[PDB]
Amino acid sequence: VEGAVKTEPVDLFHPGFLNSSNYRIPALFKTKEGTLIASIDARRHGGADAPNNDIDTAVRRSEDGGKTWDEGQIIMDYPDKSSVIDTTLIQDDETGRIFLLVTHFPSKYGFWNAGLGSGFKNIDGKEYLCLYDSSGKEFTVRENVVYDKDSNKTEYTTNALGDLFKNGTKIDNINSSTAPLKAKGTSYINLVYSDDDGKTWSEPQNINFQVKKDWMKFLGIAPGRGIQIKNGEHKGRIVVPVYYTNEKGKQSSAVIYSDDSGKNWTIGESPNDNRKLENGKIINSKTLSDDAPQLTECQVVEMPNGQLKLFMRNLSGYLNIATSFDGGATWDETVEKDTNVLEPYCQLSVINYSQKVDGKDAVIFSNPNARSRSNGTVRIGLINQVGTYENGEPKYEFDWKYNKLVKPGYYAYSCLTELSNGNIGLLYEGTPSEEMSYIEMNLKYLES
Ligand SMILES: *[C@]1(C(=O)O)O[C@@H]([C@H](O)[C@H](O)CO)[C@H](NC(C)=O)[C@@H](O)[C@H]1F
Numbered sequence: 001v002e003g004a005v006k007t008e009p010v011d012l013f014h015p016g017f018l019n020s021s022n023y024r025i026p027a028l029f030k031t032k033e034g035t036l037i038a039s040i041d042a043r044r045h046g047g048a049d050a051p052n053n054d055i056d057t058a059v060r061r062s063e064d065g066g067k068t069w070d071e072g073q074i075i076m077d078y079p080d081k082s083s084v085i086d087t088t089l090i091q092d093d094e095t096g097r098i099f100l101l102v103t104h105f106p107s108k109y110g111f112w113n114a115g116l117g118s119g120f121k122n123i124d125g126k127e128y129l130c131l132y133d134s135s136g137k138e139f140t141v142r143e144n145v146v147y148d149k150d151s152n153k154t155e156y157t158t159n160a161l162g163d164l165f166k167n168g169t170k171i172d173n174i175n176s177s178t179a180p181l182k183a184k185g186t187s188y189i190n191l192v193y194s195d196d197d198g199k200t201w202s203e204p205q206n207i208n209f210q211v212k213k214d215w216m217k218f219l220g221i222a223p224g225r226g227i228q229i230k231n232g233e234h235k236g237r238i239v240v241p242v243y244y245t246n247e248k249g250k251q252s253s254a255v256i257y258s259d260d261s262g263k264n265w266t267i268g269e270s271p272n273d274n275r276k277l278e279n280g281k282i283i284n285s286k287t288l289s290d291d292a293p294q295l296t297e298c299q300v301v302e303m304p305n306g307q308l309k310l311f312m313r314n315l316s317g318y319l320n321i322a323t324s325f326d327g328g329a330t331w332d333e334t335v336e337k338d339t340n341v342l343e344p345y346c347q348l349s350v351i352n353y354s355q356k357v358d359g360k361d362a363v364i365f366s367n368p369n370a371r372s373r374s375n376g377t378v379r380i381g382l383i384n385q386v387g388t389y390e391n392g393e394p395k396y397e398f399d400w401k402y403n404k405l406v407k408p409g410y411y412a413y414s415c416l417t418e419l420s421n422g423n424i425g426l427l428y429e430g431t432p433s434e435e436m437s438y439i440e441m442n443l444k445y446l447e448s
């Protein structure tokens with residue numbers, strides 16, 4: 001229609017960019033300064049997930065609203081088929097600090113073979129990363145100095161990247177397939193941060209000891225973005241979607257969050273914890289033994305009063321939505337199924353939109369509207385309160401009033417952002433693992 005804007009796709013990542021043959025897993029965010037940051041997996045050996053690859057994290061920035069982008073940089077790169085996989089972006093408005101979190105695996109590990117627990121051990125009241133030698137003896141890293149099982153200092157030290165130094169000389173890396181001391185083979189949550197609007201990034205902080213329980217096998221970032229709560233008593237809380245497997249391998253969503261500007265993180269309960277299934281069975285994420293109720297990658301948005309809604313990949317064929325009244329610490333027992341929104345078992349993106357649409361608060365949603373990763377569709381969901389829960393909290397529901405096909409053919413993972421001009425930016429997998437496409441759309445287009 002007249003005045004509709006949908007830009008022609010640009011390949012923001014593609015084979016050869018930064019000398020990476022493949023790319024997957026978009027994250028896209030507009031900073032407080034108005035800069036766009038796009039992060040992605042630079043999959044170096046093909047498109048496959050860990051452990052069958054060597055994956056680094058790449059970032060591009062735009063200072064002109066997505067019209068032009070910088071030359072990119074690799075910000076995390078582990079050796080020898082140790083991979084960082086699945087990024088997410090969020091910023092603390094108070095401090096201006098931008099966070100990027102990602103899942104990390106040592107060489108040979110990935111989602112399906114991750115070992116149990118955090119990979120840390122408590123010694124005398126502090127958690128220390130464990131290392132193992134060829135005989136299986138256990139060592140700890142205490143302030144980057146390696147101690148043996150009898151608390152004798154060894155000749156080894158580490159750094160935040162896992163480099164392993166013998167008397168100060170680098171000899172290997174604890175994440176490789178060859179090191180004399182290796183980390184536990186499991187997932188780790190890494191966090192890096194930027195205080196200069198994404199130009200430079202810290203080295204990784206391994207926060208597994210704060211967020212990963214002893215019964216979780218995988219715990220990973222659910223890629224895309226986080227939020228910082230705007231309304232109510234949890235205002236300022238930084239909320240990052242995640243998901244994990246239990247000892248039986250079954251997946252449940254949750255969020256990690258920080259009330260102290262990213263210094264410390266905690267994991268909330270899953271919506272699968274004390275979840276009441278359709279006909280009344282009660283499950284929990286620690287004991288879940290069936291495939292059907294699994295809840296996996298997810299993204300979160302905030303309601304007008306501060307209530308959270310967690311939108312989740314799942315096995316029902318349709319979108320599932322959980323509700324939290326306590327800032328992501330727990331969820332209502334009922335997970336809603338929205339049969340207006342097909343969900344083919346793929347990541348989705350949902351964001352708050354800053355302006356009213358048709359007099360209502362709104363969200364913007366992106367996923368493949370199909371029974372496969374195709375027919376990429378962007379929706380505007382209007383929020384309406386429809387009475388209250390038994391506990392008196394407002395009950396909010398979405399009206400998917402506007403729905404627009406933006407990508408015929410292949411469409412997999414995606415990430416939205418609102419732009420400074422009020423339009424919507426979208427970075428999406430329009431190929432399995434090669435070109436990642438960026439478009440800008442206005443509301444007139446989305447409503448057409
Ligand atoms: C997606 C994908 O489906 O395309 O899957 C994730 C997991 O394999 C899946 O959620 C497991 O049930 C990948 N992440 C990891 C850590 O394997 C994503 O990178 C992506 F591959």
Ligand SMILES: [Ca+2]
Nearest residue numbers: 054077078079
């Ligand atoms: Ca690498």
Ligand SMILES: [Ca+2]
Nearest residue numbers: 273274331332
């Ligand atoms: Ca619950």
